Amino acid sequence: PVTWCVRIXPTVRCTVRX
């Protein structure tokens, strides 16, 4: 249920963990 929006260089990604 937790979303982790991290960025790798200029690209942002939201990895959802539960």
Tab-separated table of C-alpha atoms in Angstrom, residues 1-14:
chain	number	residue	atom	x	y	z
A	1	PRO	CA	0.000	0.000	0.000
A	2	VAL	CA	3.071	2.273	-0.002
A	3	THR	CA	4.271	4.030	-3.124
A	4	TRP	CA	7.933	4.962	-3.484
A	5	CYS	CA	8.503	7.501	-6.211
A	6	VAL	CA	12.225	7.602	-6.739
A	7	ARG	CA	14.202	8.962	-9.602
A	8	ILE	CA	16.978	7.476	-11.574
A	9	UNK	CA	18.695	10.395	-13.332
A	10	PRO	CA	15.976	12.312	-15.237
A	11	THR	CA	13.543	9.420	-15.037
A	12	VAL	CA	11.132	9.153	-12.156
A	13	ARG	CA	9.589	5.846	-11.234
A	14	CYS	CA	6.995	4.958	-8.714
